[PDB]
């Protein structure tokens, strides 16, 4: 009902539309509140004719995001709910979604930069797992990137999938597909997919395979191969995330530690397949 970051609409200047989201436009804007310096924000607006259900679904993202505070989790800067249009303001992420940012920059960041991106994502997920929050839709298209290449987890919501939007099959652990048991360990499977997306500069997981083909292949022991030039130690970490037995997967603290070791010992990334 009441949001801790409700903000006066006169503190918001909406500037250009920069994207399209689930419920409407996403805009760049400026937030200037009394006693505070002006900051850049992204602004999601809910416009026109919408159900009350849609309004609650839209605002639920702000409710959840506002529970979190971490450098690798998108920060909620405020909401406008006492007036129309309804708005969610977040920190602005100059480079947008990670998957499209990497496709635009194919081959143009080094392995150590890519590992730093993956470390930031893993740190955000380490925090969510410690908060007992299961993301369920962890994918490169849900990671946002700032000007300094800091990656932050976005897309928050506790609504059930249609089977319980649809389950994102290509990112989802097999026990979550089969039994609808979503845990931080299923999040780890998804994180392995994100690693593959990052090291492939935004290629689509499983290329042209259908959803049922992916489900069957995973059950039949297929796993995505190392992306071109991918250090074998990073592919092995992906394979660890993709263990069928959820209890055998590394947990997020382990994943962060493994990436931190690579950053400290970059020579360990030189080994590549073939
Ligand atoms: C560029 N930027 N900066 C922050 C931000 C956000 N929270 N959400 C989105 C967003 C969300 C959904 C669809 N398109 C863009 N973009 C953002």
GROMACS .gro file of C-alpha atoms and ligand atoms in nm:
model
  291
    1UNK     CA    1   0.000   0.000   0.000
    2UNK     CA    2   0.244   0.267   0.125
    3UNK     CA    3   0.595   0.281  -0.023
    4UNK     CA    4   0.894   0.407   0.174
    5UNK     CA    5   1.024   0.589  -0.134
    6UNK     CA    6   0.707   0.762  -0.254
    7UNK     CA    7   0.824   1.083  -0.420
    8UNK     CA    8   0.665   1.408  -0.534
    9UNK     CA    9   0.606   1.398  -0.909
   10UNK     CA   10   0.740   1.754  -0.936
   11UNK     CA   11   1.083   1.614  -0.842
   12UNK     CA   12   1.089   1.410  -1.165
   13UNK     CA   13   1.174   1.541  -1.511
   14UNK     CA   14   1.099   1.274  -1.771
   15UNK     CA   15   1.329   1.301  -2.070
   16UNK     CA   16   1.371   1.069  -2.366
   17UNK     CA   17   1.218   0.726  -2.407
   18UNK     CA   18   1.503   0.477  -2.396
   19UNK     CA   19   1.322   0.144  -2.401
   20UNK     CA   20   1.007  -0.063  -2.392
   21UNK     CA   21   0.923  -0.269  -2.083
   22UNK     CA   22   0.652  -0.515  -1.985
   23UNK     CA   23   0.399  -0.247  -1.890
   24UNK     CA   24   0.501   0.054  -2.096
   25UNK     CA   25   0.785   0.285  -2.180
   26UNK     CA   26   1.114   0.322  -2.003
   27UNK     CA   27   1.255   0.676  -2.004
   28UNK     CA   28   1.570   0.852  -1.894
   29UNK     CA   29   1.506   1.134  -1.653
   30UNK     CA   30   1.632   1.346  -1.369
   31UNK     CA   31   1.537   1.328  -1.003
   32UNK     CA   32   1.591   1.647  -0.799
   33UNK     CA   33   1.465   1.634  -0.440
   34UNK     CA   34   1.497   1.909  -0.178
   35UNK     CA   35   1.834   1.893  -0.006
   36UNK     CA   36   1.970   1.638  -0.254
   37UNK     CA   37   2.180   1.674  -0.566
   38UNK     CA   38   2.015   1.600  -0.900
   39UNK     CA   39   2.063   1.243  -1.019
   40UNK     CA   40   1.993   1.051  -1.338
   41UNK     CA   41   1.720   0.790  -1.319
   42UNK     CA   42   1.543   0.541  -1.535
   43UNK     CA   43   1.167   0.584  -1.521
   44UNK     CA   44   0.911   0.311  -1.590
   45UNK     CA   45   0.562   0.449  -1.644
   46UNK     CA   46   0.225   0.275  -1.635
   47UNK     CA   47   0.002   0.472  -1.872
   48UNK     CA   48  -0.346   0.456  -2.019
   49UNK     CA   49  -0.600   0.188  -1.941
   50UNK     CA   50  -0.483  -0.097  -1.719
   51UNK     CA   51  -0.642  -0.336  -1.473
   52UNK     CA   52  -0.589  -0.310  -1.100
   53UNK     CA   53  -0.407  -0.644  -1.125
   54UNK     CA   54  -0.159  -0.496  -1.371
   55UNK     CA   55  -0.104  -0.196  -1.143
   56UNK     CA   56  -0.021  -0.423  -0.848
   57UNK     CA   57   0.201  -0.642  -1.065
   58UNK     CA   58   0.386  -0.335  -1.197
   59UNK     CA   59   0.432  -0.190  -0.847
   60UNK     CA   60   0.533  -0.523  -0.692
   61UNK     CA   61   0.869  -0.479  -0.863
   62UNK     CA   62   0.927  -0.161  -0.663
   63UNK     CA   63   0.813  -0.329  -0.342
   64UNK     CA   64   1.069  -0.607  -0.392
   65UNK     CA   65   1.352  -0.390  -0.527
   66UNK     CA   66   1.313  -0.155  -0.230
   67UNK     CA   67   1.396  -0.439   0.008
   68UNK     CA   68   1.747  -0.462  -0.132
   69UNK     CA   69   2.065  -0.252  -0.102
   70UNK     CA   70   2.375  -0.381  -0.279
   71UNK     CA   71   2.609  -0.239  -0.547
   72UNK     CA   72   2.519  -0.519  -0.791
   73UNK     CA   73   2.141  -0.497  -0.745
   74UNK     CA   74   1.942  -0.225  -0.924
   75UNK     CA   75   1.861   0.051  -0.678
   76UNK     CA   76   1.507   0.183  -0.634
   77UNK     CA   77   1.512   0.564  -0.624
   78UNK     CA   78   1.139   0.614  -0.574
   79UNK     CA   79   0.783   0.553  -0.683
   80UNK     CA   80   0.493   0.773  -0.783
   81UNK     CA   81   0.169   0.604  -0.680
   82UNK     CA   82  -0.042   0.884  -0.530
   83UNK     CA   83  -0.090   1.035  -0.877
   84UNK     CA   84  -0.102   0.948  -1.247
   85UNK     CA   85   0.084   0.819  -1.434
   86UNK     CA   86   0.227   0.559  -1.197
   87UNK     CA   87   0.607   0.553  -1.204
   88UNK     CA   88   0.899   0.350  -1.075
   89UNK     CA   89   1.235   0.528  -1.068
   90UNK     CA   90   1.562   0.337  -1.053
   91UNK     CA   91   1.926   0.424  -1.089
   92UNK     CA   92   2.017   0.482  -1.451
   93UNK     CA   93   2.229   0.223  -1.630
   94UNK     CA   94   2.394   0.391  -1.925
   95UNK     CA   95   2.478   0.066  -2.116
   96UNK     CA   96   2.141  -0.102  -2.084
   97UNK     CA   97   2.094  -0.479  -2.096
   98UNK     CA   98   2.408  -0.690  -2.085
   99UNK     CA   99   2.319  -0.926  -2.371
  100UNK     CA  100   2.264  -0.651  -2.626
  101UNK     CA  101   2.557  -0.450  -2.491
  102UNK     CA  102   2.790  -0.746  -2.548
  103UNK     CA  103   2.653  -0.812  -2.896
  104UNK     CA  104   2.723  -0.449  -2.985
  105UNK     CA  105   3.075  -0.493  -2.849
  106UNK     CA  106   3.150  -0.843  -2.979
  107UNK     CA  107   3.512  -0.933  -2.911
  108UNK     CA  108   3.586  -0.587  -2.777
  109UNK     CA  109   3.620  -0.654  -2.404
  110UNK     CA  110   3.894  -0.873  -2.264
  111UNK     CA  111   3.845  -1.195  -2.072
  112UNK     CA  112   3.940  -1.018  -1.748
  113UNK     CA  113   3.672  -0.754  -1.812
  114UNK     CA  114   3.416  -1.028  -1.881
  115UNK     CA  115   3.517  -1.204  -1.559
  116UNK     CA  116   3.469  -0.878  -1.370
  117UNK     CA  117   3.118  -0.853  -1.513
  118UNK     CA  118   3.045  -1.210  -1.406
  119UNK     CA  119   3.187  -1.139  -1.062
  120UNK     CA  120   2.950  -0.845  -1.015
  121UNK     CA  121   2.653  -1.055  -1.121
  122UNK     CA  122   2.762  -1.335  -0.888
  123UNK     CA  123   2.797  -1.088  -0.601
  124UNK     CA  124   2.446  -0.960  -0.662
  125UNK     CA  125   2.319  -1.318  -0.661
  126UNK     CA  126   2.525  -1.403  -0.349
  127UNK     CA  127   2.335  -1.119  -0.179
  128UNK     CA  128   1.994  -1.229  -0.309
  129UNK     CA  129   2.057  -1.586  -0.198
  130UNK     CA  130   2.160  -1.464   0.147
  131UNK     CA  131   1.834  -1.260   0.156
  132UNK     CA  132   1.648  -1.585   0.068
  133UNK     CA  133   1.533  -1.429  -0.260
  134UNK     CA  134   1.515  -1.667  -0.555
  135UNK     CA  135   1.527  -1.474  -0.879
  136UNK     CA  136   1.387  -1.740  -1.120
  137UNK     CA  137   1.465  -1.532  -1.432
  138UNK     CA  138   1.839  -1.484  -1.412
  139UNK     CA  139   1.955  -1.421  -1.771
  140UNK     CA  140   2.186  -1.171  -1.939
  141UNK     CA  141   1.884  -0.974  -2.068
  142UNK     CA  142   1.799  -0.906  -1.700
  143UNK     CA  143   2.143  -0.771  -1.611
  144UNK     CA  144   2.195  -0.397  -1.658
  145UNK     CA  145   2.529  -0.230  -1.718
  146UNK     CA  146   2.646   0.115  -1.612
  147UNK     CA  147   2.907   0.344  -1.769
  148UNK     CA  148   3.184   0.184  -1.562
  149UNK     CA  149   3.077  -0.168  -1.680
  150UNK     CA  150   2.932  -0.252  -1.337
  151UNK     CA  151   2.667  -0.519  -1.384
  152UNK     CA  152   2.355  -0.525  -1.171
  153UNK     CA  153   2.074  -0.773  -1.134
  154UNK     CA  154   1.730  -0.643  -1.232
  155UNK     CA  155   1.378  -0.778  -1.294
  156UNK     CA  156   1.215  -0.835  -0.956
  157UNK     CA  157   0.886  -1.006  -0.889
  158UNK     CA  158   0.740  -1.288  -0.683
  159UNK     CA  159   0.450  -1.381  -0.911
  160UNK     CA  160   0.433  -1.745  -1.015
  161UNK     CA  161   0.499  -1.860  -1.369
  162UNK     CA  162   0.200  -1.945  -1.587
  163UNK     CA  163   0.272  -2.315  -1.547
  164UNK     CA  164   0.241  -2.275  -1.170
  165UNK     CA  165   0.499  -1.527  -1.788
  166UNK     CA  166   0.625  -1.868  -1.892
  167UNK     CA  167   0.919  -2.051  -1.734
  168UNK     CA  168   1.229  -1.939  -1.930
  169UNK     CA  169   1.321  -2.292  -2.029
  170UNK     CA  170   1.671  -2.227  -2.167
  171UNK     CA  171   1.782  -2.064  -1.840
  172UNK     CA  172   1.600  -2.294  -1.596
  173UNK     CA  173   1.736  -2.585  -1.399
  174UNK     CA  174   1.588  -2.925  -1.484
  175UNK     CA  175   1.431  -2.980  -1.142
  176UNK     CA  176   1.268  -2.637  -1.165
  177UNK     CA  177   1.121  -2.719  -1.506
  178UNK     CA  178   1.006  -3.065  -1.396
  179UNK     CA  179   0.888  -2.999  -1.041
  180UNK     CA  180   0.856  -2.616  -1.013
  181UNK     CA  181   1.108  -2.624  -0.727
  182UNK     CA  182   1.293  -2.294  -0.761
  183UNK     CA  183   1.580  -2.237  -0.519
  184UNK     CA  184   1.907  -2.049  -0.512
  185UNK     CA  185   2.059  -2.369  -0.655
  186UNK     CA  186   1.829  -2.338  -0.958
  187UNK     CA  187   1.946  -1.978  -0.972
  188UNK     CA  188   2.303  -2.115  -0.992
  189UNK     CA  189   2.209  -2.318  -1.300
  190UNK     CA  190   2.078  -1.998  -1.459
  191UNK     CA  191   2.398  -1.821  -1.359
  192UNK     CA  192   2.594  -2.079  -1.554
  193UNK     CA  193   2.383  -1.994  -1.856
  194UNK     CA  194   2.459  -1.624  -1.798
  195UNK     CA  195   2.831  -1.708  -1.787
  196UNK     CA  196   2.793  -1.875  -2.126
  197UNK     CA  197   2.603  -1.573  -2.261
  198UNK     CA  198   2.875  -1.337  -2.140
  199UNK     CA  199   3.168  -1.539  -2.273
  200UNK     CA  200   2.988  -1.573  -2.606
  201UNK     CA  201   2.923  -1.196  -2.629
  202UNK     CA  202   2.545  -1.240  -2.616
  203UNK     CA  203   2.476  -1.544  -2.831
  204UNK     CA  204   2.142  -1.719  -2.769
  205UNK     CA  205   2.173  -2.025  -2.542
  206UNK     CA  206   2.111  -2.347  -2.737
  207UNK     CA  207   2.092  -2.153  -3.067
  208UNK     CA  208   1.794  -2.281  -3.267
  209UNK     CA  209   1.693  -2.572  -3.043
  210UNK     CA  210   1.329  -2.576  -2.939
  211UNK     CA  211   1.238  -2.566  -2.570
  212UNK     CA  212   1.149  -2.935  -2.569
  213UNK     CA  213   1.475  -3.015  -2.748
  214UNK     CA  214   1.667  -2.831  -2.475
  215UNK     CA  215   1.481  -3.017  -2.198
  216UNK     CA  216   1.554  -3.349  -2.368
  217UNK     CA  217   1.917  -3.272  -2.444
  218UNK     CA  218   1.994  -3.168  -2.084
  219UNK     CA  219   1.826  -3.486  -1.958
  220UNK     CA  220   2.048  -3.671  -2.207
  221UNK     CA  221   2.366  -3.513  -2.064
  222UNK     CA  222   2.422  -3.247  -2.329
  223UNK     CA  223   2.573  -2.923  -2.201
  224UNK     CA  224   2.660  -2.610  -2.393
  225UNK     CA  225   3.019  -2.617  -2.524
  226UNK     CA  226   3.289  -2.359  -2.446
  227UNK     CA  227   3.232  -2.038  -2.635
  228UNK     CA  228   3.508  -1.932  -2.875
  229UNK     CA  229   3.821  -1.830  -2.682
  230UNK     CA  230   3.657  -1.912  -2.350
  231UNK     CA  231   3.909  -2.009  -2.079
  232UNK     CA  232   3.857  -2.372  -1.987
  233UNK     CA  233   3.839  -2.282  -1.617
  234UNK     CA  234   3.533  -2.066  -1.690
  235UNK     CA  235   3.368  -2.342  -1.892
  236UNK     CA  236   3.437  -2.589  -1.612
  237UNK     CA  237   3.267  -2.350  -1.370
  238UNK     CA  238   2.968  -2.343  -1.607
  239UNK     CA  239   2.963  -2.724  -1.606
  240UNK     CA  240   2.971  -2.718  -1.226
  241UNK     CA  241   2.665  -2.488  -1.227
  242UNK     CA  242   2.491  -2.731  -1.463
  243UNK     CA  243   2.513  -3.043  -1.248
  244UNK     CA  244   2.184  -3.230  -1.261
  245UNK     CA  245   2.196  -3.283  -0.885
  246UNK     CA  246   2.116  -2.941  -0.745
  247UNK     CA  247   2.300  -3.020  -0.420
  248UNK     CA  248   2.627  -3.072  -0.609
  249UNK     CA  249   2.624  -2.726  -0.767
  250UNK     CA  250   2.843  -2.459  -0.611
  251UNK     CA  251   2.664  -2.198  -0.406
  252UNK     CA  252   2.697  -1.829  -0.488
  253UNK     CA  253   2.967  -1.757  -0.223
  254UNK     CA  254   3.181  -2.031  -0.381
  255UNK     CA  255   3.119  -1.888  -0.728
  256UNK     CA  256   3.232  -1.541  -0.623
  257UNK     CA  257   3.544  -1.690  -0.461
  258UNK     CA  258   3.627  -1.883  -0.779
  259UNK     CA  259   3.596  -1.569  -0.992
  260UNK     CA  260   3.801  -1.366  -0.746
  261UNK     CA  261   4.077  -1.627  -0.774
  262UNK     CA  262   4.077  -1.593  -1.154
  263UNK     CA  263   4.102  -1.216  -1.122
  264UNK     CA  264   4.398  -1.253  -0.882
  265UNK     CA  265   4.564  -1.522  -1.095
  266UNK     CA  266   4.485  -1.420  -1.455
  267UNK     CA  267   4.742  -1.663  -1.596
  268UNK     CA  268   4.493  -1.939  -1.504
  269UNK     CA  269   4.262  -1.809  -1.780
  270UNK     CA  270   4.511  -1.870  -2.063
  271UNK     CA  271   4.417  -2.238  -2.108
  272UNK     CA  272   4.152  -2.264  -2.382
  273UNK     CA  273   4.021  -2.573  -2.561
  274UNK     CA  274   4.138  -2.702  -2.899
  275LIG     C1  275   1.876   0.194  -1.918
  275LIG     N1  276   1.820   0.164  -1.786
  275LIG     N2  277   1.866   0.208  -1.681
  275LIG     C2  278   1.794   0.157  -1.580
  275LIG     C3  279   1.696   0.080  -1.629
  275LIG     C4  280   1.594   0.006  -1.579
  275LIG     N3  281   1.571   0.000  -1.446
  275LIG     N4  282   1.512  -0.062  -1.662
  275LIG     C5  283   1.533  -0.059  -1.794
  275LIG     C6  284   1.450  -0.130  -1.882
  275LIG     C7  285   1.356  -0.220  -1.833
  275LIG     C8  286   1.273  -0.291  -1.921
  275LIG     C9  287   1.284  -0.271  -2.058
  275LIG     N5  288   1.378  -0.181  -2.108
  275LIG    C10  289   1.461  -0.110  -2.019
  275LIG     N6  290   1.634   0.014  -1.842
  275LIG    C11  291   1.715   0.084  -1.761
   0.00000   0.00000   0.00000
